[PDB]
Amino acid sequence: APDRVVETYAEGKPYDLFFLDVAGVRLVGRKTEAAYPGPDRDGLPAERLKCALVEARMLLGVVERDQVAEDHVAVFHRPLGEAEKAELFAAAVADPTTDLYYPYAQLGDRVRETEGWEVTDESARELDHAEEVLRDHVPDRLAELGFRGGVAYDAACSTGAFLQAVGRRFPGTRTIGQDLSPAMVARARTRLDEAHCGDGIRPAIPEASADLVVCRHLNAFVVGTGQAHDLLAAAASRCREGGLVVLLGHTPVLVSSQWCEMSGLTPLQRSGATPSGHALFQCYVLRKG
């Protein structure tokens, strides 16, 4: 017996249906608010945050097909037992090449409300807070994948917090940020070696001059799909051959790992796990060929 999960375009959230590429099948689930940043301790329930994190309890089933209608999207799956949910998730957590993706990220009415970002200090602290798990995982993981400093470039550095954490992990690395918003640059001048204002489609640094390129904005509610591709190409062109390009998102990343492959960017990592194994999140680490 198959089952169906549905998200409508008007009131629903198609971008909350996620696929996990595990054991040569696709598992579908529906993101809800996760235990953040880590799992619940005894007598101390973790904050619940809608964010990059998905958990095993959010899984639903093994995908057979989808159906994309005039007013909703449906995924037909074989529902998973609660035990296999845990096992398949553990297997994903054990293998950072596991893809995690959101194929309807740009589908529906809510994402059309996208309109750079001039925010208050508190709003900026909230942006930073939802990327804490990312700032704690990626730097160490870049080291495990062989990064040894150099020049690091964030093509949409917002507050500068993320690239600042890369710099701290790798002493002597020059941190170069760029952001469309002048207000953001003002904030990042306090944390980066360089902070440039301008649309990332016109990169502020020369071609093949960066050892690491970071893009945390090619996401739903930030840019559109074709925009995300053009911005990836501009950012990746700043990476030298053999360098690393990293794509992350608080909201779903709009570029597929397949498109990355097509662009000559080899995925060395597609997802990351919290240290407890309780949650997974998109983490595309790509080698520039």
Ligand X SMILES: Nc1ncnc2c1ncn2[C@@H]1O[C@H](CSCC[C@H](N)C(=O)O)[C@@H](O)[C@H]1O
Ligand Y SMILES: N[C@@H](C(=O)N[C@H]1CN([C@@H](C(=O)O)c2ccc(O)cc2)C1=O)c1ccc(O)cc1
**Residues near ligand A4D (CB under 6 A):** 117, 156, 158, 178-181, 184, 199-200, 216-217, 222-223, 231
With respect to ligand X, which residue has the nearer C-beta, 56 or 133?
133
Q: Which of 3, 11, 47, 126 binds a copy of itself (CB under 8 A)?
A: 3
- Asked if 256 touches ligand X (CB under 6 A), the answer is no
Instruction: Using DSSP bridges, classify how beta strands 174-179 and 151-154 pair: parallel, antiparallel or unpaired.
Output: parallel
Closest by CA position to 215, among listed 259, 154, 268, 167: 154
Asked if residues 92 and 280 have their Cβ atoms less than 8 Å apart, the reply is: yes
32 binds, among ligand Y, ligand X, a copy of itself, none (CB under 5 to 8 A by kind): none
- Asked if 131 interacts with ligand X (CB under 6 A), we say yes
| Contact yes or no for 119/266 (Cβ under 8 A) | no
Residue 47: which H helix or E strand, with range? strand 47-49
Residues 15 and 220 sit within 8 Å (Cβ to Cβ) = yes
Binding ligand X (rule: CB under 6 A), the pick from 77, 135, 137, 216 is 216
- Member of 32, 242, 259, 275 binding a copy of itself (CB under 8 A): 259
Q: Which helix (H) or strand (E) holds 288?
A: strand 280-288
Q: What are the residues binding ligand Y (CB under 6 A)?
A: 13, 50-52, 127, 219, 221-222, 250-251
| Residue 186 touches ligand X, criterion: CB under 6 A | no
Q: Which of ligand X, a copy of itself, ligand A4D, none sits in contact with 245, Cβ below 5 to 8 A by type? A: none
Contacts of 209 (CB under 8 A, 6+ apart): 151, 153, 238, 240
Which listed range, 81-89, 186-194, 217-225, 268-276, lies at the site for ligand X (CB under 6 A)?
A: 217-225
Helix pair angle (121-130, 132-144), 10° resolution: 50
Phi and psi at residue 216, to the nearest 5°: -115, 20
Distance CA 230, CA 55 (A): 31
Site for ligand X in 2-61 (CB under 6 A): none
CA distance 64 to 75: 8
Q: Which does 82 bind (CB under 5 to 8 A by kind): a copy of itself, ligand Y, ligand A4D, none?
A: none
Please give the angle made by the CA atoms of 258, 98 and 137, to the nearest 5 degrees.
105
For the bound state, the minimum distance from the C-beta of residue 226 to a copy of itself, rounded and expressed in Å, comes to 8
Q: Which residues contact 23 (CB under 8 A, 6 or more apart)?
A: 88, 91
| Minimum separation from the CB atom of position 81 to ligand Y (A) | 26
The site map against a copy of itself for 28-67 (x = CB under 8 A) is ------------------------------------xxxx
Q: Which of residues 142-171 bind ligand X (CB under 6 A)?
A: 155-156, 158-159
Buried b (16+ CB within 10 A) or exposed e, 221-256: bbbbeebbbebbebbbbbbbeebbbbbbbbbbbbbe
Q: Which does 181 bind (CB under 5 to 8 A by kind): ligand A4D, ligand Y, a copy of itself, none?
A: ligand A4D
70 binds, among ligand X, ligand Y, a copy of itself, none (CB under 5 to 8 A by kind): a copy of itself
Q: Binding to a copy of itself by residue 71, rule CB under 8 A? A: yes
Which positions lie near ligand X, rule CB under 6 A? 116-117, 127, 131, 155-156, 158-159, 178-181, 184, 199-200, 216-217, 222-223, 231, 250
